Coordinates of C-alpha atoms in Angstrom, one line a residue:
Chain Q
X22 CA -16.2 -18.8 4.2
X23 CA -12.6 -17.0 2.9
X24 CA -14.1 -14.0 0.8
X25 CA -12.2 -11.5 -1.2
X26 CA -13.4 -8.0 -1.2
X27 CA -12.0 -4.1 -2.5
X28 CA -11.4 -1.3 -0.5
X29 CA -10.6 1.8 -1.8
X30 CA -8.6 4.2 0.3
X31 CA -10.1 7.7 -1.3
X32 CA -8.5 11.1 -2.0
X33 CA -9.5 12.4 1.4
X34 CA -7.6 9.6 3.0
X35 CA -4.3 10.0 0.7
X36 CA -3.8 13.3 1.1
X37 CA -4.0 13.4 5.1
X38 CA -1.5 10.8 5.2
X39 CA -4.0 7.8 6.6
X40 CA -2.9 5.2 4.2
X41 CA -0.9 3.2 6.8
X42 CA -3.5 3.8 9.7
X43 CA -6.3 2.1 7.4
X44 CA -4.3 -0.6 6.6
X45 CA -2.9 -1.6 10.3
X46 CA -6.4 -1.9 10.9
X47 CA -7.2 -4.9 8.1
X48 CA -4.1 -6.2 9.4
X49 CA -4.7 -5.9 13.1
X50 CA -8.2 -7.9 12.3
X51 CA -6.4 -11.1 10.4
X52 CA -7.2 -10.2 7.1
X53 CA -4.5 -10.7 4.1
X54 CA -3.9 -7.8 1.8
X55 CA -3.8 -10.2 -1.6
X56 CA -3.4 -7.1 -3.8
X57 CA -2.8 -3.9 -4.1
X58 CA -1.5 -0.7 -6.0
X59 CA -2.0 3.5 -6.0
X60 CA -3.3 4.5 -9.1
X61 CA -5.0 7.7 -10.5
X62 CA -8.4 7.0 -11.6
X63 CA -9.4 9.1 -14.0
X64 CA -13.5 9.6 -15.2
X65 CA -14.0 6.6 -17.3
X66 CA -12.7 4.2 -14.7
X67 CA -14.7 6.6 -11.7
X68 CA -18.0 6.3 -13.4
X69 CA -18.2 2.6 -14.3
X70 CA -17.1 1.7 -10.9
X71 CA -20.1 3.6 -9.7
X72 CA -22.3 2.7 -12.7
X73 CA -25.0 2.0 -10.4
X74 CA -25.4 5.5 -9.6
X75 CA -25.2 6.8 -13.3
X76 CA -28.7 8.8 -13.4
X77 CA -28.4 10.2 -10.3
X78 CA -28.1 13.6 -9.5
X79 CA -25.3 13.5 -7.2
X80 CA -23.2 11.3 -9.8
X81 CA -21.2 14.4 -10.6
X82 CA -19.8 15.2 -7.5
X83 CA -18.9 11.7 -6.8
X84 CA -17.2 11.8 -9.6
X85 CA -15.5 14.6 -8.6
X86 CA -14.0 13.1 -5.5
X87 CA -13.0 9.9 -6.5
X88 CA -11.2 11.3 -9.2
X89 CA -9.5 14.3 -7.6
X90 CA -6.0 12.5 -6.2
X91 CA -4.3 9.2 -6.5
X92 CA -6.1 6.6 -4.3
X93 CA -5.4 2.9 -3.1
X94 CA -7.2 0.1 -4.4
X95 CA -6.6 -3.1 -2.3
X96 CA -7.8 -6.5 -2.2
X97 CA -8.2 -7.7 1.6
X98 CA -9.2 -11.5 1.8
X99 CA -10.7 -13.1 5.1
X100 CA -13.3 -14.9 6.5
X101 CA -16.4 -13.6 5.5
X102 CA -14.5 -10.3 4.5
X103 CA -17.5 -8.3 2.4
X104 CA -19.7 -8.2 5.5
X105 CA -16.7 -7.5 8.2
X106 CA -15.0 -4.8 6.2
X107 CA -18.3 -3.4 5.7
X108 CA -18.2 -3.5 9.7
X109 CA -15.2 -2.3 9.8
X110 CA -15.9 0.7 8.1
X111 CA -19.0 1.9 9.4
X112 CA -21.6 4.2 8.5
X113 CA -21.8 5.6 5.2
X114 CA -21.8 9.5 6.5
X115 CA -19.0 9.7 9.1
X116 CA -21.0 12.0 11.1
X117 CA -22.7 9.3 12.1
X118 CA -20.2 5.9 12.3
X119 CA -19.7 4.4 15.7
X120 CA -16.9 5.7 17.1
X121 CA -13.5 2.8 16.5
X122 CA -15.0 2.2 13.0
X123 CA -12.5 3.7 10.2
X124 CA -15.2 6.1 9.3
X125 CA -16.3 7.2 12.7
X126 CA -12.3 7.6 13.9
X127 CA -11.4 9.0 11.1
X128 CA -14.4 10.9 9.5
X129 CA -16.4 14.0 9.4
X130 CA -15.8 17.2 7.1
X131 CA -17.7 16.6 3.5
X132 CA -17.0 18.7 0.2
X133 CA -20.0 18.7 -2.2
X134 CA -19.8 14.8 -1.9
X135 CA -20.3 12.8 1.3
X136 CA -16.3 12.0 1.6
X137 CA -16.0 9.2 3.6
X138 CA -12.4 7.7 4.2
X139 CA -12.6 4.3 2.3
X140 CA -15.1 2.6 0.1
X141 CA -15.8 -1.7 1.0
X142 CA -17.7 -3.6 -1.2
X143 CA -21.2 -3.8 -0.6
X144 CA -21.7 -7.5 -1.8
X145 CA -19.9 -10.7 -3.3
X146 CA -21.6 -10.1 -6.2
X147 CA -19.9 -6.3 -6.4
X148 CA -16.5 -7.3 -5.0
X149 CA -16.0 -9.6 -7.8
X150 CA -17.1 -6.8 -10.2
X151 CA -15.1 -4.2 -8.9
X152 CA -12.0 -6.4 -8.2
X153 CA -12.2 -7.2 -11.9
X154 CA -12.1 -3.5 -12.9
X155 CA -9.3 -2.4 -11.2
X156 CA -6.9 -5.4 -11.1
X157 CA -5.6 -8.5 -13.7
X158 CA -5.3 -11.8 -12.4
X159 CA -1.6 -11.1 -12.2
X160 CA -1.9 -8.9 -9.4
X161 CA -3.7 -10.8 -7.0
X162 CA -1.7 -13.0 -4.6
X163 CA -1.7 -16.4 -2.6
X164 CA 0.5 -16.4 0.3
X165 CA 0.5 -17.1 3.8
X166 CA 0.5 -14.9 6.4
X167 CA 2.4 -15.3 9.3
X168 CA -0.4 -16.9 11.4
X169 CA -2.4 -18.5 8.7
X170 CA -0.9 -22.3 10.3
X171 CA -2.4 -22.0 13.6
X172 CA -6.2 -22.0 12.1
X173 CA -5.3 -25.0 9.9
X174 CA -8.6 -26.7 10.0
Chain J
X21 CA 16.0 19.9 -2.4
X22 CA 13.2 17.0 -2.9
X23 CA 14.1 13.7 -3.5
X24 CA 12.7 10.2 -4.3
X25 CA 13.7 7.1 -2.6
X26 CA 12.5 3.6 -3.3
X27 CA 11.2 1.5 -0.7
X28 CA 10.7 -2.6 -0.4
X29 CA 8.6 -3.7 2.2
X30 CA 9.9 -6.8 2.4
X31 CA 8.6 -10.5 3.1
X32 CA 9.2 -10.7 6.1
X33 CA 7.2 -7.0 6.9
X34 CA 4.3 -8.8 4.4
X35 CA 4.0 -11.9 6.4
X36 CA 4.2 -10.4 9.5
X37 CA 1.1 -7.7 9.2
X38 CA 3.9 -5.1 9.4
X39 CA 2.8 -3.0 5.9
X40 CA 0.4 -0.6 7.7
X41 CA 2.8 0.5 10.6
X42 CA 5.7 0.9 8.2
X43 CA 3.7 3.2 5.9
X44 CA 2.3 5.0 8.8
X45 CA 6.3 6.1 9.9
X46 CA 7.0 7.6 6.2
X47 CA 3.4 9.2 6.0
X48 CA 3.7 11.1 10.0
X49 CA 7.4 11.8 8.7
X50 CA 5.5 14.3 6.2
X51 CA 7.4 11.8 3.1
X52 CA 4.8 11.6 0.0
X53 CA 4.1 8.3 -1.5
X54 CA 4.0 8.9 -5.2
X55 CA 3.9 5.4 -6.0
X56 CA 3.1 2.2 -4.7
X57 CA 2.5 -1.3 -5.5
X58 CA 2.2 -4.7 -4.4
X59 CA 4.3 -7.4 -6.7
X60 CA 5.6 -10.6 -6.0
X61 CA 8.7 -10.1 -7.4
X62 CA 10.8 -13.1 -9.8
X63 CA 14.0 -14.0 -9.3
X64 CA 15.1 -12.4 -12.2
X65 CA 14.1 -8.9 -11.2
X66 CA 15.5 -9.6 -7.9
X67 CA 19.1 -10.0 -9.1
X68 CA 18.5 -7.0 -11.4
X69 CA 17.7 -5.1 -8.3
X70 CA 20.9 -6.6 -6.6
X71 CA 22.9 -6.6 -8.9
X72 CA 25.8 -5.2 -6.9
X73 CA 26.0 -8.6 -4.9
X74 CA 25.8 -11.0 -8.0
X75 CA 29.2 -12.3 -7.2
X76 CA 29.0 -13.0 -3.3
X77 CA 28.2 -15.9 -1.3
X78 CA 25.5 -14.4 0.3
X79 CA 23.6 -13.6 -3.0
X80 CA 21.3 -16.6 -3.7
X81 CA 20.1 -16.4 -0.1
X82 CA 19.0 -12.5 -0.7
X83 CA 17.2 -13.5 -3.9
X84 CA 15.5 -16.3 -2.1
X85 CA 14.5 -14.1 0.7
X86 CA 13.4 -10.9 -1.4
X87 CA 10.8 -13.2 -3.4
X88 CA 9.6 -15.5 -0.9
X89 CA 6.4 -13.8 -1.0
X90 CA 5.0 -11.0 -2.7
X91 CA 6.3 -7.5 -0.8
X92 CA 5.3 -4.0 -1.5
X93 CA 7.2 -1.7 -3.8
X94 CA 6.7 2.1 -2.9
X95 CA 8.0 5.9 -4.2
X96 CA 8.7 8.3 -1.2
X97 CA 9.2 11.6 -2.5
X98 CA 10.3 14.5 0.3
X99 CA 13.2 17.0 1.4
X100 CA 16.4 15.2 1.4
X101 CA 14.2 11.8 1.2
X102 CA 17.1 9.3 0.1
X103 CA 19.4 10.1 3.5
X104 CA 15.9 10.8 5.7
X105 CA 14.5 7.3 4.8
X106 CA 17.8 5.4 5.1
X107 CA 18.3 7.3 8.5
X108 CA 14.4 6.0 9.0
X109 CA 15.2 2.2 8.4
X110 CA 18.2 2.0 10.4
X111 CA 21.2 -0.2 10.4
X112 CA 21.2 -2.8 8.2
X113 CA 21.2 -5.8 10.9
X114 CA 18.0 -5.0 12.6
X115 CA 20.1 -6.7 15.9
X116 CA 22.1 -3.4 16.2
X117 CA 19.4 -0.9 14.9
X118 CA 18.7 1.5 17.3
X119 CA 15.4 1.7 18.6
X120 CA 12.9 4.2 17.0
X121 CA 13.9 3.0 13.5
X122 CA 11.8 0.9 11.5
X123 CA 14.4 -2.1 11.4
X124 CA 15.4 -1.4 15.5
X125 CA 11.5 -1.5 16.5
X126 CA 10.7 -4.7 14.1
X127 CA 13.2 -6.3 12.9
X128 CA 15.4 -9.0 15.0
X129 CA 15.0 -12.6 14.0
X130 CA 17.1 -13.7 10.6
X131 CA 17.1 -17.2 7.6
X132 CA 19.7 -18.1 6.2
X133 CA 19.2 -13.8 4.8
X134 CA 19.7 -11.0 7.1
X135 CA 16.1 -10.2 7.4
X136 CA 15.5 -6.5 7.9
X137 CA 12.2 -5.6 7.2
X138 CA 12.5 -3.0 4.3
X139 CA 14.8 -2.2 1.6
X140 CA 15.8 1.4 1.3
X141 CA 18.0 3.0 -1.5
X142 CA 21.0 3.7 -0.5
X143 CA 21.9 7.2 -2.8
X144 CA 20.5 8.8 -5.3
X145 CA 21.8 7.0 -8.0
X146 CA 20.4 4.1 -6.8
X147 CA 17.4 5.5 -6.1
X148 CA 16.7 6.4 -10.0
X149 CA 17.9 3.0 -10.9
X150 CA 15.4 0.9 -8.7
X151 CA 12.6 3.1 -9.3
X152 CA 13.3 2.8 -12.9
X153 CA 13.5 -1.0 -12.6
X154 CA 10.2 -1.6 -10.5
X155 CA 7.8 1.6 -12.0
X156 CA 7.0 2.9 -15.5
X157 CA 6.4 6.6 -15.2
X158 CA 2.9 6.2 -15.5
X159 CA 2.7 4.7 -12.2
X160 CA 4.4 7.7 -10.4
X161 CA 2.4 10.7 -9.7
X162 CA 2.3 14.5 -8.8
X163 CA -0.4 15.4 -6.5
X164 CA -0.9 17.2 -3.3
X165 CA -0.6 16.0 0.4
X166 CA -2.7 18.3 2.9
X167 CA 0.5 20.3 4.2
X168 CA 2.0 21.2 1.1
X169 CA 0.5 24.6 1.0
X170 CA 2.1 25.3 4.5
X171 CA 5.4 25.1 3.3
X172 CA 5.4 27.2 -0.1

């Protein structure tokens, strides 16, 4: 049932200083940060991480935002981790994510794109994808996390 | 005048679910991350970094301890940032860190290493060594953080 899936802590998040916030809460929850680094993604990267949204008129923007300070691009492994962070998360427009969901807490004020916080993987199939764009083999990790004995199964 | 500082979240902070918390301290402190990264580092690298304690007793234990599992490397750039973040992690044995600090809040328990949940540099000239030694410029970068405006 142990997934891996990418989160993406985006320029609105970096530059209010929520990095560590985001990530105490993927902690908090059980889930192991296997990878991890701040890069600088620059158009290229941006639009064939959201190739999917290529012809779209709003593609430009997104763009825009993705691209417009350094992010974090993590790895967080777990139990069925795609759907949970997902969860975790919440809605896609902050406005309307349940409050204690990252986006709902933390949330609200858009710029010409819908800026949300974070970005989760919306599938297996796109963690994989994604998780192979922004990171080598290299630079993911197996190790054990304090508690990882007690579950032993 | 601004500074850079390197920063090891240890193993011991890794294993522990500590990484979040830690980064939260630097980031409320107003302190920039301008580079970050998560590495499991070798044991060559780890003398490298130690290098200073290649001929004590206590040295094989550190390298042990540094690279039992992987640990997060980060850039804190700020006013004064070397002295602020050393003042920030505390003393050294987290038994006689006051509280507050990150090592007298976290840090207690020890191996056969005086485990203190982060590495700080301890001056400036260290600071441009270690960064040097763990980032390639290209990993480093100049961008804004919500306040800078304020202070200008």
């Amino acid at each position: 049932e142990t997934e891996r899936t990418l989160v993406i802590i985006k320029p609105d998040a970096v530059v209010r200083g929520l990095i560590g916030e985001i990530i105490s809460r993927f902690e908090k929850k059980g889930l192991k940060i296997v990878g991890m680094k701040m890069i600088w993604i620059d158009r290229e990267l941006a639009e064939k991480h959201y190739e999917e949204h290529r012809e779209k008129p709003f593609f430009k923007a997104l763009i825009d935002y993705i691209t417009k300070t350094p992010v974090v691009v993590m790895v967080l492994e777990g139990r069925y981790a795609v759907e949970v962070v997902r969860k975790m998360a919440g809605a896609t427009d902050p406005k309307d994510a349940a409050p204690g969901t990252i986006r709902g807490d933390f949330g609200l004020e858009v710029s010409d794109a819908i800026c949300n916080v974070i970005h989760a993987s919306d599938s297996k199939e796109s963690a994989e994808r994604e998780i192979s764009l922004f990171f080598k083999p290299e630079e993911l990790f197996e190790y054990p996390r304090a508690a990882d004995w007690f579950y032993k199964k």
